[PDB]
Amino acid sequence: MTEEERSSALSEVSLRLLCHDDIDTVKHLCGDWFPIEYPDSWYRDITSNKKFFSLAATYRGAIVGMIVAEIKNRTKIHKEDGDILASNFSVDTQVAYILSLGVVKEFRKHGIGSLLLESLKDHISTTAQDHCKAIYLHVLTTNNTAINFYENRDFKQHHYLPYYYSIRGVLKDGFTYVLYINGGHPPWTILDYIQHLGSALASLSPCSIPH
Ligand SMILES: CC(=O)SCCNC(=O)CCNC(=O)[C@H](O)C(C)(C)COP(=O)(O)OP(=O)(O)OC[C@H]1O[C@@H](n2cnc3c(N)ncnc32)[C@H](O)[C@@H]1OP(=O)(O)O
């Protein structure tokens, strides 16, 4: 391996947004990555609609991983996950949904998935720090590799969703995972919250509190 070969290697991996020309490649990869099936509309939307943050990692120009997400108003969360954020956050409050994350199997366990997730966080910080208060996604309950990846990155299991998915026509369970950011938190009734509060304030010395 020449020094010239070493220098070249440094520009080989890069990141870019998806485009419409990507659709056929993205379909092939997704067919490998996920045992579920996405409709044609999904591929067209993720590649072409600017509302999505669709980010590819490439090696020698070829896509080797992607993360696809949507930053959207809290009201757009689907009903099964409607309880992710407290409803007294501002009407302008947003969340980020991860539609998809995948890395070609050959390239796994080199940090690509991690960098894609980090890039989405960086994009949120750049674009929507004022309003985005959670990141959420779904996995198959059987997907230990994904579960571990998310749990080790501080996402927490939020809901159990029975028969959420179809693999070759056979229904399979899912989980919702959530990471709160920028002060996001789940809904509480006031009465429940005040009960919880006693544990939170316990650390305060009685002497420090006016009485
Ligand atoms: C909407 C959804 O989220 S769908 C669910 C996610 N997608 C899938 O399950 C599709 C199939 N699976 C995949 O595509 C991959 O397995 C992914 C996306 C889950 C992870 O992608 P990867 O590129 O392998 O992730 P990454 O390399 O960052 O980290 C994975 C493991 O590799 C290890 N790792 C990280 N960096 C390195 C490294 N530099 N060298 C060796 N190992 C590393 C860590 O042990 C990490 O382990 P952990 O998961 O226990 O924390």
Residue numbers in the entry: 1 to 211
What's written in the study?
As the first N-terminal acetyltransferase discovered on an organelle, NatF, encoded by NAA60 and also named as Histone acetyltransferase type B protein 4 (HAT4), Naa60 or N-acetyltransferase 15 (NAT15), is the youngest member of the NAT family. As an N-terminal acetyltransferase, NatF can specifically catalyze acetylation of the N-terminal α-amine of most transmembrane proteins and has substrate preference towards proteins with Met-Lys-, Met-Val-, Met-Ala- and Met-Met-N-termini, thus partially overlapping substrate selectivity with NatC and NatE18. Another important feature of NatF is that this protein is anchored on the Golgi apparatus through its C-terminal membrane-integrating region and takes part in the maintaining of Golgi integrity. The structure of hNaa60 protein contains a central domain exhibiting a classic GCN5-related N-acetyltransferase (GNAT) folding, along with the extended N- and C-terminal regions.
There is one hNaa60 molecule in the asymmetric unit in the hNaa60(1-242)/Ac-CoA structure. The C-terminal region extended from the GCN5-domain forms an amphipathic helix (α5) and interacts with a molecule in a neighbor asymmetric unit through hydrophobic interactions between α5-helix and a hydrophobic groove between the N-terminal β1 and β3 strands of the neighbor molecule. In hNaa60(1-242), the β7-β8 hairpin is located in close proximity to the α1-α2 loop, creating a more compact substrate binding site than that in hNaa50, where this region adopts a more flexible loop conformation (β6-β7 loop). In hNaa60(1-242), the β7-β8 hairpin covers the active site in a way similar to that observed in hNaa50, presumably leaving only one way for the substrate to access the active site, i.e. to enter from the opposite end into the same tunnel where Ac-CoA/CoA binds, which may accommodate access of a NAT substrate only. Indeed, superposition of hNaa60(1-242) structure on that of Hat1p, a typical KAT, in complex with a histone H4 peptide27 revealed obvious overlapping/clashing of the H4 peptide (a KAT substrate) with the β7-β8 hairpin of hNaa60(1-242). A solvent-derived malonate molecule is found beside Phe 34 and the ethanethioate moiety of Ac-CoA in the high-resolution hNaa60(1-242)/Ac-CoA structure. Superposition of this structure on that of hNaa50p/CoA/peptide shows that the malonate molecule overlaps well on the N-terminal methionine of the substrate peptide and residue Phe 34 in hNaa60 overlaps well on Phe 27 in hNaa50. However, in the hNaa60/Ac-CoA structure, a hydrophilic malonate molecule is found at the same location where the N-terminal methionine should bind as is indicated by the superposition, suggesting that Phe 34 may accommodate binding of hydrophilic substrate, too. Residues Tyr 38, Asn 143 and Tyr 165 are located around the malonate and interact with it through direct hydrogen bonds or water bridge.
